[PDB]
Amino acid sequence: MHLTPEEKSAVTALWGKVNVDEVGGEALGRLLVVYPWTQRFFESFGDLSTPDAVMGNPKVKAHGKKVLGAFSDGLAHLDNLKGTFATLSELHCDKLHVDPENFRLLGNVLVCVLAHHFGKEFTPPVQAAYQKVVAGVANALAHKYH
Template identity: 55%
Template sequence: NNRVSLFRLLTVYPWTQRYFASLGDLSSPAAIMGNPKVATHGKVVMGALEKGVKNLDDIKSTYAALSEMHSDKFHVDPDNFKLLTESLTICVAMKLGPSVFTADAQDAWSKFLAVVVSAFCEQSR
């Protein structure tokens, strides 16, 4: 489910909601989970990650425009990207289970997300 990791981010770290005012009602966990704009943005996030997987050799330029937008337009604190990766990791682990999301798989996933976060934070430096 595309909305679960974003739901987790917005409920576990409620201060991140300030970056998502355009999504509408985020007043409660039920409102967040039922919000179609949260689901849509979750799809956008997963699509961006898929784009990164397909462009591992040029990930910095793959995310250049998104990095600029999140830094200059939305003024996102780079630490919040790390919070999102934590939420993503937990949700992926729960969905896949320990037989698929092994320690080696988690290590590879974490390294990939670290590269993505680094690329996203490029404009903030």
């Protein structure tokens, strides 16, 4: 994946301040609230009836942490996203049966959560760098689908 020096600096600088646990649970929870059809993969997570229940659901919180932790490791290898996420790509296609469009929805929700958390610091140029990054990761996670 390629970025300008300006972009890569902005992404890594902000990420150093992200608490992956708190942001991960927020992002997954908002995904399930805002786009409720995504709930179809988490039927075992408990009741997902209302935003109140979703956001405080302990399994949602934990899964969120796992997902963004893996996301975080991806940011260490921005120049080789496809090779970094290959195994997880296969897992998501062959074992979990997840439509890759969901990766794009989560990417956009994640950008919303970063804006919500960091406010004015999440400037238009910083957003633009994260938009490239979340699309690069979604494309890497979809790469081994067949």
